[PDB]
Design a protein around this ligand. Structure first.
Ligand SMILES: [Zn+2]
Ligand SMILES: [Zn+2]
Ligand SMILES: [Zn+2]
Lengths: 65, 102, 114, 43, 133, 196, 141, 159, 49, 263, 84, 559
RNA sequence: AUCGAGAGGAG
DNA sequence: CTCCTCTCCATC
């Protein structure tokens, strides 16, 4: 369910980063590694918040009313 | 009065072995007062060790064997939980019988 | 459901002042101060700072249970010098030390670029 | 769900033990603790 | 209230026996041959090593609450480098006409072995140890 | 729980400030105590941990598949070239003090699972309450504000203590206790209770 | 085209099987001390080879990372704790009406996955977060 | 087998001795064999030992056994307990089993025996045979919900 | 994602758990205990599929 | 000039990387503690969902709003809601906020943090602005909406401190290292062969002298020089984060000083 | 029947059981405002009171001890020694 | 059986338990909730009216209050409702059902109920958070762990009843237990891995720390102990202050294999008068040992003093370990490269040995041992050739482990672990078994259909050559998978008997008890035993003490 | 009231 | 023919 704001163990706002993470994954061909670093995510706690998150909302939305 | 002696007999030969003259002078050098104290409290120490009329021994013994029983889980003999099961049952049909001639 | 409220960590309650003071029975010139609604953030602080003062024999703190914010600072000191001052003098020392740390940091924050 | 849909019970030799022929038909690890231990098995 | 033994010892082995800070030091007494000493020295804050000479004092004086120093204005019997505090446990007849005391400097241990160290080297709680030079 | 049968319960909740922390400022989400490791052989658990670190850093899939050429000596090299010490350890600092830790610590991402059984759907007390019909004893479950069974086996442990009155308190006052009238001749309960 | 056939346990009784279909039947012609020790090619007839041995595992147990480095009954324990471990159980949980239904606020896929964890759809409807853990004594709580 | 044993000089010293350990029990006949010490020969058959050497030798083999099961696990139980268990078995005459046919039929109160295994049948024959039950047992007072002859209720308080 | 091997009955889903049973039409031999005059027995559960 | 010295190597909008000289460990720490947990901030504390046909449930959303960064620059001249004498809100304590979003489009409409509308009296001060550090200028995904789904509500941001909830932290991650080569010998390295090759030298080893083997242990040594670096979520800008630390610390230090007097 | 103030074995010492039910039996009186037969030096618990009445041997209670043959013995709480 | 001899009952509660290393041994951290719920009927007596009328006014849901006030005529006055609940003047002799209060007696147990010890009196300590908290050294006798074991609390209801917990069942009284005439609580995990760590020579704690630790013990005498070190720096030994917790007149004599009043391996244990002289404290000293400091302190000083002790040792070592701290990595299960090489060649010469017996036995020269089959004397040889391979490869693992090795350190401490745990985790795992025999032929004359028939080598009958950190292989996995499970079977079954046995054993001795003539009789009056235990001694007050009248020289006895 | 599954701890 | 517990389902 959606990208968490802020990362549980460290505190860095990670919310804004999601939609960003996706493009420099796939717009300008980059490997998930380097993408987490361009986004300022240097700590692994604060890297794992994004590397792992499965955006289940997109699939939630697929339902109708 | 005869069980009284018998019931103490073991404790005494200890007592003797330790509070015998040459030792209570040489190895550990007591003094009339000090000694007389060692003697004094040993009586009141013993006294406190006697079983209290009431002590519910039935359960007490049983649990005390029934517990270590549960600590058992895994040289060709029936041991452990299943042996106990023979022993308590007066096993007519004992799986490993075995003489041990001397 | 049994949880204690999260503001009970810095607010005080009722008929609960932020310092209790009491004389330690065991030693002479000895005092055990109970801090309501505080912890290591400034228990450890005063204690080591109540240590650089040469007129102090003894100085320790302890959070009885990390369940409630209350630590006990016990202090014994030299013949004469009442510990109530010992605490003061140290509590102040800190104020200055930090007071200086602020400006000094201010100075150097204004040197940098970006 | 994935597992509960693939479960194998057995009613009532040594039937709970993991047997050589179970190799790659029954899961060696997956079976419930106590009660019906091993008697139920997963594919 | 005084000073209870003295001599200059000759260290014959250092023992780093699975410890970094604490060493066991076996020594010998130059003066009278009827003497040897095993002692537990904190080689971290005072190194001890090869065929090395050092002086050993005991004393028993200069007890409710240890003060801090301030002693940068006091008397210390500090003319020494290394000085620990102990309790004495068993005093043993090696045999003879020979004697030996044992010591626990809070677990750092000491064996001294001689004779003239009888009415001198006492029985009690008191017992410091001052090494130097 | 972890992923290798390392079932635990929270015993205490610490804030970010009383937590130990690495020199890069990371607090840990979880302190499991290293007494749990060596009496249930769970070596994987530890391995997972080390690979994960490297996965969280290399921004990669951790490859934990069963039969592979995936080595602890393989994994560890990888996180040497990364910046940490090739076996997970990270110098941490105590939280109250900020004094260094006398001994390094194992740290890492580690898939953890929050299982059912949470304290509050369990906590049950009863001080008198609803009885059943048949025997006016208190009723099963905590679903019913029931009562707790002081079954035979515990009574044994009450007989052992030589607790006489107290075993009576369980076996009369709380639970049953009933007042029946009995015959001075026959000895049954045929007595008429015309009380008043 | 018959490159794979379905063998039942009784027919199993009369075959020679290969764990790996690669380093199992090539030519025999250094040994990185860290790689576990597998026996040898020993046996010459091989009727049919194994697809991949991980597939001897169930649906709960293949969710375990490195089950092969673990003490067996532990694996088993997981295997019964995976079926009590909270998460996204179905995408439609908003519309279904079930006596009791749990889901995870921000369920993360694990960081270390299985190659089986793929058809298991697990890394898409995870049950658990990827928390940093300190293993150490602290307050002894 | 080893044997720690007195020297004339005095010191107990280890002297090894050959033992025969068998895989089959007959004790009426192996001891009566010449060549072997018939003051030590021992079976793990504590039922046979009872038929041969007397109730009182049984009491021992039965301990020795009970003990030796507990002690192979490392567990030490303090003698007074097994010595109670082992006794209750021995005391009636032979080997009274720790099961329904042993203790749970032996002329005790009815209400008690009742609260173990064959519940009704005891109560049945209890009614047919006019058994006047004692209420000196524990259970007989748990049944009746009463302050029973135990630790606290052994004695009796007065003014 | 619902792969669905169940039925619905009274709303609640229901799963039929695969049952286990020794098969028929074999044909086995069972070494029987000593206090049995019966030594070996060749058993065969016979039913038509 | 008089005591605690402080160099700063690198400074930025979000990082205060600085040495800190001539100080006790005791406080150097208690700085980090307060910094992390005790300098007050503003962040949504009441939420009044009006209509919510999202797939994210009500309390889910009411949670992330919590976590959102709201400008806490002038926060010092705002009152703790508990303290102030109005019942519930007033402009002196509380800043309100509106969020209305409604699926207007086919192509999944977001709700970023930037369409939180301030509704209360700002009274001039600097407060309650969703900090945008986003490039495209819309930090924090709140939730996503479908075609015909809306979400309307009121947020009532209040003064709070991390001790009362981590949402109120303004500090993110504070780095803290002291004595890079272990010359204090406060740790004992765990090794298999070298210890030296087995752990890597911290970037902090350049600014401090190596040991030299020929030197024996310096026993009387203490902890000077701490190599901190403060990060900043960014409700409070990087500088004040350290400062407000030194102050609030100083504050309670003094409140305990006053206490003795008030008895 | 009866057993005389003489010819008494019976342990002169107080059984841990005997003693606990003495403490109890007084505590049940002290909890229902029956008079305290010692000076209560600032204690208020009817259990902790009894423990002083016992330290000072001022409890007007007897033990009746039953021997399993149906005989019995009387023991005043001032007569028994309180060791343990 | 289900209704009369064990009833459901009131005034009871039940919850998950958790660890609390700053509770007292006898204390029971009870959640506020549960404390708000259970009630003790207290009376209106001049000694309480004050504190009591207060409670009435407090309310049946602010903690130190109550529900229900009971009167003369004998009725319920229900304090949640009722128009008069902020009034009620209390008249002497009315009972006032009160909330369970701090420091009350309670019966607190874990099940299965298999001592008089998984069952005992406790001191109540009302607390937040809905878990039942108990001290980690009342762990052993309930058989607890805090991984979600639940526990049951009962509350007395009569003054006399309260007493019957307080005097008999009190946890400190149960410290030295009749079962094994030895104490059943001790020093456990963190504490125990600390108490050793703290204590080894090398470990020196100085002023700042020492000052706190001293204060940390609540029974401190306020005198900084004179430091063992006073020289270029002053320091106290680990031992030094730990000794602050040790009471007075407490002495201990141990002596291990290499112990010689110097203990050059810091072996044995010598404690003189509340201070410790030499010797590393660990399981054998501080544990639940026979000779243990706990066994001494309890006899010598009392229960009370010993139930205080537990805390102080903990409260301290806990503190020291809070600031030192220790962990465990996979690196603590690694072994050196020339060890790892040597381990494999230790298996690989044992691999020859099996092969060569199987070489022998195939060529009909394997001499049949007496009374056993040839096939058996093969089976026997290999299984002994394969245990001795793992045990030796294990000892090679243990020897390579440096003293900085955490796993070692817990094993040295006796906190958790063993030799086998090293050996599997680092060297090899060893042979699996299924009903005592190596892995069986499930398939016809072969193990898995990946093998040939007629193969009796180790590889094929379930010898797991690889270590746990190396990672087993598929065959291997399955094999260990077979053995693992054998445990579980009886963990589901070697229980169902062991519960039926206890059930009888109890029922059959049940009502046997010492009477008022030291005789041991039962309900019938039939003597079982003429003095209890053959000497009329409670086993609690009994100690293993040598009899130096027996062994040793006819000569040495004279002299 | 009655049946029946699935779990929890001792592995 | 192991204690104790939780929770959900279907019924004359
Ligand atoms: Zn983070
Ligand atoms: Zn009648
Ligand atoms: Zn306001």
């Amino acid at each position: 369910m959606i990208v968490p704001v802020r990362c549980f163990s460290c505190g860095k706002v990670v919310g804004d980063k999601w939609e960003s993470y996706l493009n420099l994954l796939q717009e300008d061909e980059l490997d998930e590694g380097t993408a987490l670093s361009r986004l300022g995510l240097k700590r692994y706690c604060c890297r794992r918040m994004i590397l792992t998150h499965v955006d289940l909302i997109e699939k939630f939305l697929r339902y109708n009313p | 009065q005869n069980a009284q002696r018998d019931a103490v007999t073991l404790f005494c030969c200890l007592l003797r072995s330790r509070l015998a003259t040459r030792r209570v002078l040489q190895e550990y050098r007591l003094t009339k007062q000090a000694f007389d104290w060692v003697l004094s409290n040993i009586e009141a120490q013993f006294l406190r060790s006697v079983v209290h009329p009431g002590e519910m021994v039935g359960v007490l013994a049983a649990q005390s064997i029934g517990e270590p029983a549960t600590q058992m889980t895994l040289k060709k003999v029936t041991s452990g939980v299943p042996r106990l099961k023979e022993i308590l049952n007066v096993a007519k049909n004992m799986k490993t019988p075995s003489l041990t001639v001397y | 459901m049994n949880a204690p409220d999260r503001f009970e960590l810095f607010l005080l309650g009722e008929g609960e002042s932020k310092l209790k003071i009491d004389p330690d029975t065991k030693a002479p010139n000895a005092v055990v101060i109970t801090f309501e609604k505080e912890d290591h953030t400034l228990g450890n602080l005063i204690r080591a700072e109540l240590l650089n003062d040469r007129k102090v024999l003894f100085a320790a703190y302890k959070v009885e249970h990390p369940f409630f914010a209350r630590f006990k600072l016990r202090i014994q000191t030299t013949e004469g010098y009442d510990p109530k001052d010992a605490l003061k003098n140290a509590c102040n020392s800190i104020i200055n030390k930090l007071g200086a740390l602020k400006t000094n940091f201010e100075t150097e924050w204004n040197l940098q670029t970006l | 769900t994935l597992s509960h849909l693939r479960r194998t019970n057995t009613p009532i030799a040594k039937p709970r033990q993991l047997h050589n022929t179970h190799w790659g038909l029954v899961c060696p690890a997956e079976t419930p603790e106590g009660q019906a231990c091993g008697l139920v098995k997963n594919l | 209230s005084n000073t209870l033994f003295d001599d200059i010892f000759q260290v014959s082995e250092v023992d780093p026996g699975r410890y970094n800070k604490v060493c066991r030091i076996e020594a010998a007494s130059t003066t009278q041959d009827q003497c040897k000493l095993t002692l537990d020295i904190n080689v971290e804050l005072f190194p001890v090593a090869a065929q090395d000479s050092l002086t050993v004092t005991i004393a028993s004086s200069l007890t409710r609450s240890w003060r801090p120093p301030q002693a940068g204005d006091r008397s210390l019997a500090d003319d020494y480098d290394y000085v620990m505090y102990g309790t004495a446990y068993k005093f043993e007849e090696v045999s003879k006409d020979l004697i030996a005391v044992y010591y626990s400097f809070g677990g750092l241990l000491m064996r001294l072995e001689g004779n003239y160290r009888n009415l001198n080297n006492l029985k009690q709680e008191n017992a410091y140890l001052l090494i130097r030079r | 729980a972890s992923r290798h049968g390392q079932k635990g319960t929270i015993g205490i909740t610490y804030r970010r400030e009383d937590m130990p922390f690495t020199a890069e400022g990371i607090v840990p989400d979880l302190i499991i105590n290293p007494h749990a490791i060596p009496s249930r052989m769970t070596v994987a658990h530890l391995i997972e941990c080390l690979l994960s670190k490297v996965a969280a850093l290399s921004g990669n899939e951790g490859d934990a598949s069963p039969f592979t050429d995936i080595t602890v000596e393989g994994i560890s090299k990888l996180l040497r070239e990364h910046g940490y010490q090739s076996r997970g350890f990270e110098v941490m600092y105590n939280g109250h003090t900020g004094k260094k830790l006398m001994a390094q610590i194992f740290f890492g991402p580690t898939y953890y699972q929050r299982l059912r059984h949470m304290v509050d759907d369990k906590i049950h007390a009863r001080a008198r309450g609803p009885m059943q019909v048949l025997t006016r004893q208190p009723v099963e479950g905590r679903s019913r504000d029931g009562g707790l069974r002081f079954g035979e086996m515990e009574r044994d442990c009450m007989i052992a203590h030589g607790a006489a009155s107290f075993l009576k308190e369980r076996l009369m006052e709380a639970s049953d206790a009933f007042r029946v009238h009995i015959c001075g001749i026959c000895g049954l309960m045929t007595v008429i209770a015309k009380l008043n | 085209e018959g490159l794979v056939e379905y063998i039942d346990a009784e027919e199993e009784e009369s075959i020679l099987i290969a764990m790996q279909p690669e380093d199992l039947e090539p030519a025999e012609a250094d040994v990185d001390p860290a790689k576990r020790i597998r026996v040898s090619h020993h046996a010459t007839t091989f009727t049919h080879c194994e697809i991949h041995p991980s597939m001897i595992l169930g649906v709960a147990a293949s969710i375990i990372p490195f089950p092969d480095h673990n003490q067996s009954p532990r694996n088993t324990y997981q295997s019964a704790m995976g079926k009590q471990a909270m998460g996204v159980f179905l995408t439609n949980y908003n519309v279904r009406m079930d006596t009791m239904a749990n889901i995870l606020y921000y369920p993360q896929k694990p960081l270390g996955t299985t190659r089986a964890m793929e058809y298991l759809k697990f890394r898409e409807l995870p049950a658990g977060q990827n928390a940093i853990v300190a293993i150490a004594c602290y307050s002894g709580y | 087998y080893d044997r720690k044993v007195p020297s004339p000089t005095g010191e107990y010293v280890k002297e090894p001795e050959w033992v025969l350990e068998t895989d089959g029990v007959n004790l009426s006949e192996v001891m009566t064999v010449p060549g072997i010490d018939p003051t030590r020969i021992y079976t793990n058959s504590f039922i046979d030992i009872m038929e041969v050497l007397g109730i009182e030798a049984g009491r021992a083999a039965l301990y020795k056994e009970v003990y030796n099961v507990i002690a192979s696990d490392g567990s030490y139980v303090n003698y007074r307990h097994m010595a109670l268990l082992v006794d209750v078995m021995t005391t009636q005459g032979g080997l009274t089993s720790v099961t329904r046919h042993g203790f749970n039929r032996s002329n005790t109160g009815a209400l008690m025996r009742c609260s173990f295994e064959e519940t009704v049948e005891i109560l049945f024959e209890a009614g047919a045979s006019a058994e006047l039950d004692d209420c000196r047992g524990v259970s007989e007072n748990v049944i009746l919900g009463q302050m029973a002859p135990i630790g606290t209720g052994a004695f009796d308080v007065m003014i | 994602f619902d792969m669905g091997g169940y039925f619905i009955i009274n709303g609640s889903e229901k799963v039929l758990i695969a049952q286990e049973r020794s098969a028929g039409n074999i044909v086995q031999v069972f070494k029987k205990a000593a206090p049995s005059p019966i030594s070996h027995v060749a058993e065969i559960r016979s039913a038509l599929e | 000039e008089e005591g605690p010295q402080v160099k700063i190597r690198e400074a930025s909008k979000d990082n205060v990387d600085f040495i800190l000289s001539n100080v006790d460990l005791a406080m150097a720490n208690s700085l980090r503690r307060v910094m992390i947990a005790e300098i007050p901030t503003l962040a949504i504390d009441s939420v009044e969902v009006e209509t919510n046909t999202t797939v994210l449930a009500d309390e889910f959303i009411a949670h992330r709003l919590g976590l959102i960064p709201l400008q806490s620059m002038d926060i010092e001249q705002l009152e703790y809601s508990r303290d102030c004498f109005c019942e519930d809100h007033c402009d002196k304590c509380s800043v309100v906020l509106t969020l209305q979003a409604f699926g207007e489009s086919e192509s999944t409409t977001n709700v970023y943090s930037k369409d939180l509308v301030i509704v209360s009296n700002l009274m001039g001060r600097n407060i309650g602005h969703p900090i945008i550090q986003d490039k495209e200028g819309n930090g924090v995904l709140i939730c996503k909406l479908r075609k015909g789904q809306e979400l309307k509500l009121t947020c009532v941001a209040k003064k709070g401190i991390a001790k009362e909830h981590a949402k109120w932290g303004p500090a993110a991650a504070i780095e803290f290292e002291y004595d890079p080569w272990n010359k204090l010998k406060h740790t004992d390295y765990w090794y298999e062969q070298d210890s030296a090759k087995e752990w890597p030298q911290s970037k902090n080893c350049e600014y401090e002298d190596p040991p030299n083997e020929g030197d024996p242990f310096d026993y009387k040594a203490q902890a000077d020089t701490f190599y901190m670096n403060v990060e900043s979520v960014g409700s409070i800008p990087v500088d004040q984060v350290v400062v407000r630390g030194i102050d609030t610390l100083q504050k309670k230090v003094a409140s305990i000083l006053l206490a003795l007097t008030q008895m | 029947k009866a057993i005389p103030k003489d010819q008494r074995a019976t342990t002169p010492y107080m059984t841990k059981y005997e003693r606990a039910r003495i403490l109890g039996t007084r505590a049940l009186q002290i909890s229902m405002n029956a008079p305290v037969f010692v000076d209560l030096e600032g204690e208020t618990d009817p259990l902790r009171i009894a423990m002083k009445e016992l330290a000072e041997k001022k409890i007007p209670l007897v033990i009746r001890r039953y021997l399993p043959d149906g005989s019995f013995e009387d023991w005043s709480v001032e007569e028994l020694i309180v060791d343990l | 059986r289900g209704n009369l001899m064990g009833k459901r009952v009131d005034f009871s509660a039940r919850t998950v338990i958790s660890g609390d290393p700053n509770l007292e041994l006898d204390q029971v951290g009870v959640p506020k909730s549960i404390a708000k719920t259970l009630t003790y009927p207290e009376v209106v007596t001049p000694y309480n009216i004050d504190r009591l009328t207060q409670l009435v006014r407090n309310g049946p849901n602010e903690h130190p209050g109550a529900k229900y006030v009971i009167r003369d005529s004998g009725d319920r006055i229900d304090l949640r409702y009722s128009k008069r609940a902020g009034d009620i003047q209390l008249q002497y002799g009315w009972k006032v059902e009160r909330h369970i209060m701090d420091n009350d007696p309670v019966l607190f147990n874990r099940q299965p109920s298999l001592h008089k010890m998984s069952m005992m009196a406790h001191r109540v300590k009302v607390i937040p958070y809905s878990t039942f908290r108990l001290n980690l050294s009342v762990t052993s006798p309930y058989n607890a762990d805090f991984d979600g074991d639940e526990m049951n609390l009962h509350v007395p209801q009569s003054e006399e009843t309260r007493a019957e917990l307080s005097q008999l069942c009190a946890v400190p009284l149960q410290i030295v237990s009749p079962q094994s005439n030895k104490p059943c609580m001790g020093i456990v995990q963190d504490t125990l891995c600390g108490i050793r760590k703290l204590t080894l020579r090398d470990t020196f704690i100085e002023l700042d720390q020492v000052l706190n630790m001293l204060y940390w013990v609540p029974d401190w005498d306020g005198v900084i102990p004179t430091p063992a070190i006073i020289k270029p720096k002053p320091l106290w030994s680990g031992k030094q202050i730990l000794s602050v917790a040790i009471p007075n007149g407490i002495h201990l004599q141990r002596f291990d294999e290499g112990t010689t009043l110097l203990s050059p391996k810091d072996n044995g244990m010598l404690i003189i008068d509340g201070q410790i002289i030499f010797g590393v404290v660990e399981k054998k000293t501080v544990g639940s040992s026979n000779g243990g400091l706990i066994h001494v302190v309890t006899r010598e000083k009392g229960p009370q003093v010993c139930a205080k002790l537990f805390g102080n040792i903990q409260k301290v070592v806990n503190f020291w370990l809070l600031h030192n701290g220790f962990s465990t990595g996979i690196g603590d299960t690694i072994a050196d490269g020339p060890t790892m090489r040597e381990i494999t060649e230790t298996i690989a010469e044992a691999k020859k040995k099996v092969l060569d017996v199987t070489k022998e036995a195939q060529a009909n020269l394997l001499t049949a041992k007496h009374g056993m089959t040839l096939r058996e004397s093969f089976e026997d040889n290999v299984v002994r050739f394969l245990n001795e391979a793992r045990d030796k490869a294990g000892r090679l693992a243990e020897v390579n482990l440096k003293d900085l090795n955490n796993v070692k350190q817990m094993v040295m401490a006796g906190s958790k672990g063993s030799f086998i745990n090293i050996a599997q985790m680092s060297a090899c795992v060893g042979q699996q078994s299924v009903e005592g025999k190596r892995i069986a032929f499930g398939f016809v004359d072969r193990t898995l259909p990946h093998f040939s028939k007629d193969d009796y080598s180790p590889e094929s009958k379930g010898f797991v050559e690889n270590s746990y950190l190396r990672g087993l292989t598929p065959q291997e996995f399955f094999f260990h998978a077979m053995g693992g499970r054998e445990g579980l079977i009886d963990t589901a079954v070697k229980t169902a008997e062991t519960g039926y046995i206890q059930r009888r054993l109890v029922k059959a001795l049940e009502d046997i008890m010492v009477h008022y003539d030291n005789t041991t009789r039962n309900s019938l009056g039939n003597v079982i035993q003429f003095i209890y235990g053959e000497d009329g001694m409670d086993a609690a007050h009994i100690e293993k003490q040598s009899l130096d009248t027996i062994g040793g020289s006819d000569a040495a006895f004279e002299k």
